[PDB]
Design an enzyme around this catalytic site. Structure first.
Site, PDB file in Angstrom:
ATOM      1  N   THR C   1       0.827  -1.201   0.000  1.00 18.98           N
ATOM      2  CA  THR C   1       0.000   0.000   0.000  1.00 18.98           C
ATOM      3  C   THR C   1       0.865   1.255   0.000  1.00 18.98           C
ATOM      4  O   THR C   1       1.719   1.430   0.867  1.00 18.98           O
ATOM      5  CB  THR C   1      -0.943   0.035   1.215  1.00 18.98           C
ATOM      6  OG1 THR C   1      -1.833  -1.088   1.163  1.00 18.98           O
ATOM      7  CG2 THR C   1      -1.759   1.318   1.217  1.00 18.98           C
ATOM      8  N   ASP C  17      -2.123   3.600  -4.743  1.00 18.90           N
ATOM      9  CA  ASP C  17      -2.104   2.335  -5.458  1.00 18.90           C
ATOM     10  C   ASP C  17      -3.387   1.563  -5.167  1.00 18.90           C
ATOM     11  O   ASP C  17      -4.191   1.942  -4.314  1.00 18.90           O
ATOM     12  CB  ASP C  17      -0.878   1.512  -5.063  1.00 18.90           C
ATOM     13  CG  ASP C  17      -0.991   0.935  -3.668  1.00 18.90           C
ATOM     14  OD1 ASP C  17      -1.061   1.722  -2.700  1.00 18.90           O
ATOM     15  OD2 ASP C  17      -1.013  -0.306  -3.538  1.00 18.90           O
ATOM     16  N   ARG C  19      -3.470  -2.092  -4.684  1.00 16.26           N
ATOM     17  CA  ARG C  19      -3.057  -3.460  -4.376  1.00 16.26           C
ATOM     18  C   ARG C  19      -3.385  -3.754  -2.917  1.00 16.26           C
ATOM     19  O   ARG C  19      -2.656  -3.338  -2.011  1.00 16.26           O
ATOM     20  CB  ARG C  19      -1.573  -3.669  -4.663  1.00 16.26           C
ATOM     21  CG  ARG C  19      -1.082  -5.071  -4.347  1.00 16.26           C
ATOM     22  CD  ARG C  19       0.192  -5.406  -5.101  1.00 16.26           C
ATOM     23  NE  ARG C  19       0.011  -5.299  -6.543  1.00 16.26           N
ATOM     24  CZ  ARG C  19       0.933  -5.623  -7.440  1.00 16.26           C
ATOM     25  NH1 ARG C  19       2.119  -6.081  -7.076  1.00 16.26           N
ATOM     26  NH2 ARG C  19       0.656  -5.488  -8.733  1.00 16.26           N
ATOM     27  N   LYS C  33      -8.454   2.915  -2.567  1.00 19.73           N
ATOM     28  CA  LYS C  33      -7.854   3.396  -1.332  1.00 19.73           C
ATOM     29  C   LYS C  33      -8.059   4.889  -1.119  1.00 19.73           C
ATOM     30  O   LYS C  33      -7.577   5.430  -0.119  1.00 19.73           O
ATOM     31  CB  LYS C  33      -6.360   3.063  -1.310  1.00 19.73           C
ATOM     32  CG  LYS C  33      -6.079   1.571  -1.276  1.00 19.73           C
ATOM     33  CD  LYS C  33      -4.592   1.275  -1.241  1.00 19.73           C
ATOM     34  CE  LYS C  33      -4.337  -0.221  -1.301  1.00 19.73           C
ATOM     35  NZ  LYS C  33      -2.899  -0.536  -1.511  1.00 19.73           N
ATOM     36  N   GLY C  47      -2.904   0.687   5.816  1.00 24.59           N
ATOM     37  CA  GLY C  47      -2.923  -0.178   6.979  1.00 24.59           C
ATOM     38  C   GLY C  47      -4.030  -1.209   6.920  1.00 24.59           C
ATOM     39  O   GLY C  47      -4.314  -1.760   5.852  1.00 24.59           O
ATOM     40  N   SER C 129       3.029   1.136   3.274  1.00 25.73           N
ATOM     41  CA  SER C 129       4.235   0.315   3.308  1.00 25.73           C
ATOM     42  C   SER C 129       5.309   0.869   2.380  1.00 25.73           C
ATOM     43  O   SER C 129       6.491   0.901   2.740  1.00 25.73           O
ATOM     44  CB  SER C 129       3.899  -1.128   2.935  1.00 25.73           C
ATOM     45  OG  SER C 129       5.049  -1.951   3.005  1.00 25.73           O
ATOM     46  N   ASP C 166       8.128  -1.222  -4.419  1.00 22.30           N
ATOM     47  CA  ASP C 166       7.553  -1.975  -3.312  1.00 22.30           C
ATOM     48  C   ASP C 166       6.655  -3.051  -3.900  1.00 22.30           C
ATOM     49  O   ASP C 166       5.719  -2.742  -4.645  1.00 22.30           O
ATOM     50  CB  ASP C 166       6.768  -1.074  -2.358  1.00 22.30           C
ATOM     51  CG  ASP C 166       5.978  -1.865  -1.334  1.00 22.30           C
ATOM     52  OD1 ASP C 166       6.582  -2.712  -0.645  1.00 22.30           O
ATOM     53  OD2 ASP C 166       4.756  -1.640  -1.217  1.00 22.30           O
ATOM     54  N   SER C 169       2.466  -3.317  -3.388  1.00 15.00           N
ATOM     55  CA  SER C 169       1.709  -2.130  -3.761  1.00 15.00           C
ATOM     56  C   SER C 169       1.641  -2.037  -5.276  1.00 15.00           C
ATOM     57  O   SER C 169       2.573  -2.447  -5.971  1.00 15.00           O
ATOM     58  CB  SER C 169       2.341  -0.855  -3.188  1.00 15.00           C
ATOM     59  OG  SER C 169       2.479  -0.931  -1.781  1.00 15.00           O
TER      60      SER C 169
END
Lengths: 226, 238, 220, 64, 247, 204, 237
Positions: C1, C17, C19, C33, C47, C129, C166, C169
């Site tokens: 994320t 993102d 994911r 999101k 989170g 993240s 990452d 994400s």
């Protein structure tokens, strides 16, 4: 005692006095047209000291639910605040249904804290509800003690009797377009004493696109050519 | 009257609360009191009826110490007066515990007046039958004196009287020239005014409870030394 | 994320993102999101997805009620205060890290909300993240009072860096641009990751998958 | 979409200002599709206003 | 003489409760007739003002559970909350036992709550009496009538409306157990409703009827819509015309 | 771990104007099977089903509570549930026990009562909705269903081929996992009919 | 009976208890005037001080609820102080829950809701004090509102409360009907001359206490003796 009370043999005397109180003097007509619902009321402020853009008689409870009322305005404020909280709670529980007309019946039903738990003194306001998120419009009335009536055209003022008579004689009808607001204004005119103006008359409309309290510009535009 | 002066929650046809209008009558009937703001402090004084000589030295005194620098001179129904004094003591203690230092007299008077108004607002509870003066002094805020009616609100008083003879005391209070007289002569003069007010004309012998607060006592509201203020009582007698 | 936001000249741009993963396996490829609060303010989530969704829906409902009661537009500071009170009441048990952005009558505002209840007002905010990559992209390529298209490009670059650097994400870029008079949601704005076509007809025709018994219950 | 009826009102105002009769009569006979496409009250009052303006100046007693 | 609800009389009567139950007779009109392979309810639509839309789709008849339905005859304010509580009780039983709630148990729970309301505290008695029709595994089709006194009764042909005495007399005169079927029950219900409603040739709008039938291992509660109701009216009118002319 | 206490594997996929939900029919403690006819697919309506995966006790509790709330709502409103609304109701019910969550991962599969629009969604234990248009699954071996579906799914698929694909995916997944299997139940929901099939599966 | 004794609806369809409380506002012997202007809003009320043993420093009827909203109270002083304390608590709680300062209209709405709760039920009684609150509001200019013991919160431009409130409202209606905006000299003078014509004492600059909130200068200025004396001299010129 601490609820809706004072019911003698075959009567609801306290409720009947509440209904005598809600006779009021603010017509607040409502018309359910094919395209939507129009809730028009009269704002006849005492003198010019008071303001019309400060306080409102029509309150949007949610996205497409509009509300008009009758006597005992201070009670109506608490009632509309409770209705907004209840509709918001329903929308939070059942997340994202865009609930207006599948909620208009539900919000009218949850208008049981409105009277079935009166609060020692019952509410002295009768309110008309409009919603159109079902492909069809809805007009409901909740009185100081009863429940949903699902009106098509009614009035709740001092001359509500002759207002309703005017509504039926003028044939509220079923094929009428969204611009039945002209007939609503005419019905107010019967229960109005003066040259009604944009600030003197407050009206909200609820169509399939949503609910909107008409600004004084459109109210004056409709009042023109009447 | 009749059905309107039964509970405080019932408004009069003219828009009055007759329960408090009758609670004021108890204060009007009970013994009088006087409190004068001297130049650098506040001096209290209350006469108390010794209803019987069976009683010891002055007890159930109309003067109370609600806080270190604050004192209360009350008149009216004495039991509810003591309960309200306990309430004021609790309020002062709570304020000192929360915000530190010492509770300002205006805020204490406002809070106790709000509590009294809460008691006179409802129906189950009844309005307090007592009226009192709250007097205090500090270097920062000088000397203040607030008087609370059984239902009214605190008001700033240069010099105030309450009880049986309010007007009679207030006439000589306004005759007295405060704001430039030290608290010593103010003690003498409050004793003089109380003895000018009738004591034994139709009642028993009266005792003179006088209180002190000021820079001469560096705050610290305390009862005046009665042994050395007996001569002030003698001057009042003359 | 990976979620991010920036304050441009006329308002706020938010990027995120899409994911949503269960452990180390991708579950949702188009998880929204970015959550609507009021027609002038949005907010990005990170989170615990369920806690974030419930919290943001509650705040949106309460703020809609508040705006209806007041009759005026809501304010970003009010939403921040509500979020902070709600999160600090639970002392971080709500594992929701939020990026609040909006346009008020006093000017555009952008805030960062932490699960323990911490908040601050920043010109640029990153969370999640993969927040570190987007934060680095901002620090490298941030210019105050930067125009709408340039701000959108910067947010897209930061989101793309978070996506490609990452593993937990990405798969889409969700954008929203808001100003004094414009609210524009963009949904997938750029898809830098496309699934390759399946070579050959890897499909099963009928007749296979032998069945023990079958029940048919017709309706109206 | 309502600007057309504004133009019809605008044209009718100039016709009344100039005093035209045949042009106003033709306009009234022509706008009938637009009359039956909008709110009944608004169309009705537009018809009344145009008719009153036409009957005001030019006294064609054999035609009014 | 009346006072706070929890009182008695010098004789020993609950005159507040009796007054409420008598007031139930005033206003509203519902009747339930039980027959084999189907039990139905007939309701009198009181207000037929042309300014309504009839979108609630039901005013007197309420669907309270998959296997039962009720019809109130009291004040609507208490009727709504009583119906909500009844549905809640039925669904709570369904959750607890994973089985449709027997009609008698549901009626006993509702009359228990009404008895509690008239028993303790300074609370008004629930001024509403309602019928119930339903089907269960033990007793099959059942009909029950509950009054505000909380003393329900297991009936098979009853009325609870204004002219409830006249309606029940008409039922008793023209009720035949065993031989009764769903169609004959419909005919009898329409006939007794025409008797209790003074205006002859009752319109399909002023009468709302619902029939509960047992399909193949499933209970179907169908409210009869306008066309079917007026077809029943037409058949009844033909029967009346033939009977009157054949003399 | 705990989510794998009683096993379970539930699948849902989208076709062209039709949906398909499938689940294993195994119940048992860590290593043994107790019965081969356990119910994990529950009909919330004529054209709407729910699948639950996790602890069997939590499966049954969530199913019963959701049925209770749904019946109450249906009685209150009188119109049939919309699948999005029921997914929302499931999400709220799961979140009501945030700190005591029912260890289940419900999925929703059904059609709109009027538009007949296919709708498939998944939820975590807390209640986060994951609405997509291709497929969702849940259980111990969700990664296996993902791996199978990412190559066996085709958009705009006829109900017969949709059934074939869902059956293949479920059978292979319950063959390659160690806790779920011994029979697969599949429901194909069309605009007018329900197709319930019990697949021929490895009973071991 | 008890229709006129408790907060219950009358058989005629009225509520007599609040009707009595409104007259209770008239009881007490005081009046107040609120005038909204082109850019400012001023409120003035008489300061009836019997005997000088009282402290004129604290006998006031106007207060600061927050940094930008000021009220004036009419009626019984105890209920007035209680409602002032409640309004201050509401303003502080709003500022804590919502970052921006509480709008004056919202504060009036909350106070009116509290009063409507008071007129509801039967255990408590309505507070016999009418509060007129003013304050500058962005995108709205000066704003003036009145909350009554019933719960009807409204009032604007020129509004008065007290014993002789009708005469003041009539004169202010005449003034506002005269179409000319009042600057920050004309608004104050209009309020002063209104209250002076209501009670003709020529208003020695010690018996009134005026509160002012302007737009360029926020905050509730309780104008001192010098300011009121200067305004009085300018008006009587």
């Amino acid at each position: 005692f601490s609820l809706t009370t004072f019911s003698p043999s075959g009567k609801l005397v306290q409720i009947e006095y509440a209904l005598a109180a809600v006779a009021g003097g603010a017509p607040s007509v409502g018309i359910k047209a094919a395209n939507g619902v129009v809730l028009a009321t009269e704002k006849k402020q005492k003198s010019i000291l008071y303001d019309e853009r400060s306080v409102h008689k029509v309150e949007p409870i949610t996205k497409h639910i509009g509300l008009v009322y009758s006597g005992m305005g201070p009670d109506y404020r608490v009632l509309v605040h409770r209705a907004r909280k209840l509709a918001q709670q329903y929308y939070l529980v059942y997340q994202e249904p865009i609930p207006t007309a599948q909620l208009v019946q539900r919000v009218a039903s949850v208008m049981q804290e409105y009277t079935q738990s009166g609060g020692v003194r019952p509410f002295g306001v009768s309110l008309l509800i409009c919603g159109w998120n079902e492909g069809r419009p809805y007009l409901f009335q909740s009185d100081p003690s009863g429940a949903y009536f699902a009106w098509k055209a009614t009035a709740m003022g001092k001359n509500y009797v002759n207002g309703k008579t005017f509504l039926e004689k003028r044939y509220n009808e079923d094929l009428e377009l969204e611009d039945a607001i002209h007939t609503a204004i005419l019905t107010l005119k019967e229960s109005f004493e003066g040259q009604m103006t944009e600030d003197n008359i407050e009206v909200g409309i609820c169509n399939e696109a949503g609910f909107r309290r008409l600004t004084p510009t459109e109210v004056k535009d409709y009042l023109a050519a009447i | 009257g009749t059905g309107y002066d039964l509970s405080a929650s019932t408004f009069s046809p003219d828009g009055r609360v007759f329960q408090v209008e009758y609670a004021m009558k108890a204060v009007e009937n009970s013994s009088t009191a006087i409190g004068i703001r001297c130049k650098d402090g506040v001096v209290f004084g209350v006469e108390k009826l010794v209803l019987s000589k069976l009683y010891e030295e002055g007890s159930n005194k109309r003067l109370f110490n609600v806080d270190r620098h604050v004192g209360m001179a009350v008149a009216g129904l004495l039991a509810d007066a003591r309960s309200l004094a306990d309430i004021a003591r609790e309020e002062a203690s709570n304020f000192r515990s929360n915000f530190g230092y010492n509770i300002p007299l205006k805020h204490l008077a406002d809070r106790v007046a709000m509590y009294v108004h809460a008691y006179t607002l409802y129906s189950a509870v009844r309005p307090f039958g007592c009226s009192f003066m709250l007097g205090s002094y500090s270097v920062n805020d000088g000397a203040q004196l607030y008087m609370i009616d059984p239902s009214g609100v605190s008001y700033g008083y240069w010099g105030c009287a309450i009880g049986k003879a309010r007007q009679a005391a207030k006439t000589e209070i306004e005759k007295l020239q405060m704001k430039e007289m030290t608290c010593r002569d103010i003690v003498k003069e409050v004793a003089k005014i109380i003895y000018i007010v009738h004591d034994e004309v139709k009642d028993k012998a009266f005792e003179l409870e006088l209180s002190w607060v000021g820079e001469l006592t560096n705050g610290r509201h305390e009862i005046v030394p009665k042994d050395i203020r007996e001569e002030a009582e003698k001057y009042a007698k003359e | 994320t990976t979620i991010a936001g920036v304050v441009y000249k006329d308002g706020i741009v938010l990027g995120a993102d899409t994911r949503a993963t269960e452990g180390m396996v991708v579950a949702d490829k188009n998880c929204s999101k970015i959550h609507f609060i009021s027609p002038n303010i949005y907010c990005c989530g990170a989170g615990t997805a369920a806690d974030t969704d419930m919290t943001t829906q509650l705040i949106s409902s309460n703020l809609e009620l508040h705006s209806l009661s007041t009759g005026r537009l809501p304010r970003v500071v009010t939403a921040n205060r509500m979020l902070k009170q709600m999160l600090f009441r639970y002392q971080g048990y709500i594992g929701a890290a939020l990026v609040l952005g909006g346009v008020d009558v006093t000017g555009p505002h952008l805030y960062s909300i932490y699960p323990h209840g911490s908040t601050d007002k920043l010109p640029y905010v990153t969370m999640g993240s993969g927040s570190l990559a987007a934060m680095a992209v901002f620090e490298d390529k941030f210019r105050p009072d930067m125009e709408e298209e340039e701000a959108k490009n910067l947010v897209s670059e930061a989101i793309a860096a978070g996506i490609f650097n990452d593993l937990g994400s990405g798969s889409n870029i969700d954008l929203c641009v808001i100003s004094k008079n414009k609210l524009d949601f963009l949904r997938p704005y750029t898809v830098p990751n496309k699934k390759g076509t399946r070579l050959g007809r890897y499909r099963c025709e009928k007749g296979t998958t032998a069945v023990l018994t079958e029940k048919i219950t017709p309706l109206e | 979409v309502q600007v057309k009826e504004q133009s019809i009102l605008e044209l009718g105002s100039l016709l009344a200002k100039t005093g035209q009769a045949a042009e106003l009569g033709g306009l009234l006979k022509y706008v009938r599709p637009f009359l039956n496409s909008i709110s009944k009250a608004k169309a009705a009052r537009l018809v009344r206003s145009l008719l009153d303006l036409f009957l005001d100046m030019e006294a064609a007693t054999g035609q009014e | 003489y009346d006072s706070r609800t929890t009182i008695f009389s010098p004789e020993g009567r609950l005159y507040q409760v009796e007054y409420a139950m008598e007031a139930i007779g005033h206003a509203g009109t519902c009747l339930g007739i039980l027959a084999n392979d189907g039990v139905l309810l007939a309701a009198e639509r009181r207000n037929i003002h042309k300014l309504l839309d009839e979108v609630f789709f039901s005013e007197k008849i309420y669907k309270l559970n998959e296997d039962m339905a009720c019809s109130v005859a009291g004040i609507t304010s208490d009727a709504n909350v009583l119906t909500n509580e009844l549905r809640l009780i039925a669904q709570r039983y369904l959750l607890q036992y994973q089985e449709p709630i027997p009609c008698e148990q549901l009626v006993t729970a509702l009359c228990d709550i009404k008895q509690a309301y008239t028993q303790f505290g300074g609370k008004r008695p629930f001024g509403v009496s309602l019928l119930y029709i339903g089907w269960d595994k033990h007793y099959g089709f059942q009909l029950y009538q509950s009054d505000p006194s909380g003393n329900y009764g297991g009936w098979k042909a009853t009325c609870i409306g204004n002219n409830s005495a006249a309606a029940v007399s008409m039922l008793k005169q023209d009720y035949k157990e065993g031989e009764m079927t769903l169609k004959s029950a419909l005919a009898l219900a329409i006939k007794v409703l025409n008797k209790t409603m003074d205006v002859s040739k009752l319109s399909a709008e002023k009468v709302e009827i619902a029939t509960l039938t047992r399909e193949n291992g499933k209970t179907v509660i169908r409210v009869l819509k306008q066309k079917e109701v007026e077809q029943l009216i037409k058949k009844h009118e033909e029967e009346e015309a033939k009977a009157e002319r054949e003399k | 771990s705990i989510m794998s206490y009683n096993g379970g594997a539930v699948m849902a996929m989208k076709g062209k104007n039709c949906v398909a939900i499938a689940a294993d029919r195994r119940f048992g403690i860590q290593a043994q099977m107790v019965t081969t006819d356990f119910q994990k697919i529950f009909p919330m309506g004529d054209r709407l089903y729910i699948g639950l995966a996790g602890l069997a006790t939590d499966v049954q509790t969530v199913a019963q509570r959701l049925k209770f709330r749904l019946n109450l709502y249906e009685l209150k409103e009188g119109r049939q549930i919309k699948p999005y609304t029921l997914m929302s109701m499931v999400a709220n019910l799961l979140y009501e026990k945030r700190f005591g969550p029912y260890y289940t991962e419900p999925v929703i599969a059904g059609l709109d009562p009027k538009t007949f629009k296919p709708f498939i969604c998944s939820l975590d234990l807390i209640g986060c909705p994951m609405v997509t248009d291709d497929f969702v699954v849940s259980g111990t071996c969700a990664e296996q269903m993902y791996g199978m579906c990412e190559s066996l799914w085709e958009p705009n698929m006829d109900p017969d081929h949709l059934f074939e694909t869902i059956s293949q995916a479920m059978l292979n997944a319950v063959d390659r996992d160690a806790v779920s299997g011994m029979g697969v139940i599949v429901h194909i929901i069309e605009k007018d009919k329900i197709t319930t099939r019990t697949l021929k599966a490895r009973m071991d | 009976g008890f229709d006129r004794h408790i907060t219950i609806f009358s058989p005629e369809g009225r509520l007599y208890q609040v009707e009595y409380a409104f007259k209770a506002i008239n009881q007490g012997g005081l009046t107040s005037v609120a005038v909204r202007g082109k850019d400012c809003a001023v409120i003035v009320t008489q300061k009836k001080v019997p005997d000088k043993l009282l402290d004129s420093s604290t006998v006031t009827h106007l207060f600061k609820i927050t940094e930008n909203i000021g009220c004036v109270m009419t009626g019984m002083t105890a209920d007035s102080r209680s409602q002032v304390q409640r309004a201050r608590y509401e303003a502080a709680n709003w500022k804590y829950k919502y970052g921006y300062e509480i709008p004056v209209d919202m504060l009036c709405k909350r106070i009116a809701d509290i009063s409507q709760v008071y007129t509801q039920n039967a255990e408590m009684r309505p507070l016999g004090c009418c509060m007129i609150l003013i304050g500058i509001d962005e995108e709205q200019g000066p704003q003036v509102y009145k909350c009554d013991p019933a719960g009807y919160y409204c009032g604007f431009k020129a509004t008065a409360a007290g014993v002789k409130q009708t005469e003041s409202t009539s004169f202010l209606e005449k003034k506002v009907k005269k179409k000319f905006d009042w600057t920050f000299e004309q608004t104050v003078e209009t309020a002063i001359t209104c209250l002076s014509t209501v009670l003709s004492i020529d208003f020695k600059p010690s018996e009134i206490e005026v509160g002012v909130v302007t737009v360029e200068n926020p905050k509730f200025r309780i104008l001192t003796e010098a300011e009121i004396d200067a305004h009085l001299v300018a008006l009587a010129e």
